[PDB]
Structures are given as structure tokens and as C-alpha cells.
Amino acid sequence: AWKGEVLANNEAGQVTSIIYNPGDVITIVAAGWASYGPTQKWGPQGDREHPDQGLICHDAFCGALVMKIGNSGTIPVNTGLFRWVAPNNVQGAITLIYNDVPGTYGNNSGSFSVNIGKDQS
Numbered sequence: 737a738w739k740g741e742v743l744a745n746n747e748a749g750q751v752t753s754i755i756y757n758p759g760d761v762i763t764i765v766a767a768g769w770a771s772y773g774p775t776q777k778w779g780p781q782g783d784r785e786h787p788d789q790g791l792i793c794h795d796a797f798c799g800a801l802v803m804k805i806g807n808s809g810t811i812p813v814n815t816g817l818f819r820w821v822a823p824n825n826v827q828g829a830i831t832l833i834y835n836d837v838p839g840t841y842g843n844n845s846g847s848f849s850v851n852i853g854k855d856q857s
């Protein structure tokens with residue numbers, strides 16, 4: 737089980753110690769406040785009013801928490817996942833990422849605190 741911080745201005749994202757293996761069931765809970773530029777801050781679901789200007793994850797709002805499992809595309813996490821199972825052939829290290837447009841991460845601020853564990857399976 738892993739606990740750590742995911743900085744909004746961390747473009748490469750935060751690698752975790754969780755390796756998702758076939759058949760794993762995982763639960764994630766994310767909390768906190770971040771911004772992708774403005775003086776306002778948003779939670780892990782991001783800013784529901786803001787258009788997509790080339791986000792790393794087109795399936796979540798700008799300012800939301802997303803992840804990659806190994807070589808995968810981005811997958812929405814938002815506030816978290818309850819006893820979640822990945823698609824077939826998705827496996828590897830979980831990297832947690834703040835959803836912004838590539839190259840726009842420098843004006844970001846705040847972070848989300850995140851817990852990940854593996855469930856019974």
C-alpha cells in the first residue's frame with residue numbers, strides 16, 4: 737500500500753510503489769486542492785467548466801487526478817477508485833498525474849494526497 741503527494745506542477749507525474757498485476761483489485765482515495773493556473777483551486781475531479789485545450793487525459797476535467805499503469809494511456813482517478821479492476825493487458829507501475837496540457841505545468845500549484853492499496857482478490 738502506498739501513500740504520497742502528487743504535485744500539480746509535476747508533468748512527468750508521481751511514480752508509486754504499486755505495480756498493478758493481472759487480476760489485481762485496487763482502491764484509491766485522493767484528497768486536496770490544486771490549480772492548473774488560476775488563483776482558485778479545485779479538488780481531484782478538476783474544473784468542470786474548463787474546455788479541453790489538449791489535456792493528457794481527455795476523459796477527465798482539467799485539474800483532475802489521472803494515472804498511467806505501465807505503458808497505458810491515461811485513466812481517470814478523480815476522487816478515487818473503489819475495488820477497481822483494470823482492462824485486460826493493462827499492467828505495470830502506477831504513475832499518478834495531474835491532468836493538464838503538456839508544457840503548461842509550470843504555472844500549476846498545490847497537490848493531492850493519495851492512498852492506493854490492493855484489495856482481496
Ligand SMILES: OC[C@H]1O[C@H](O[C@H]2[C@@H](O)[C@@H](CO)O[C@@H](O[C@H]3[C@H](O)[C@@H](O)[C@H](O)O[C@@H]3CO)[C@@H]2O)[C@H](O)[C@@H](O)[C@H]1O
Binds near residue numbers: 786798836
Ligand atoms: O487549459 C489548460 C490551461 O489553462 C490555463 O490557460 C487559460 C488562460 O490562459 C486563460 C486566460 O484567462 O485563457 C484560457 O483560455 C480561454 C481563452 O483565452 C478564451 O478566448 C476562451 O473564450 O476561453 C478559454 C477558456 O477559459 C486558458 O485556458 C492555464 O493558464 C494553462 O497553464 C493551462 O493549464
Ligand SMILES: [Ca+2]
Binds near residue numbers: 772836840841843844
Ligand atoms: Ca497550467
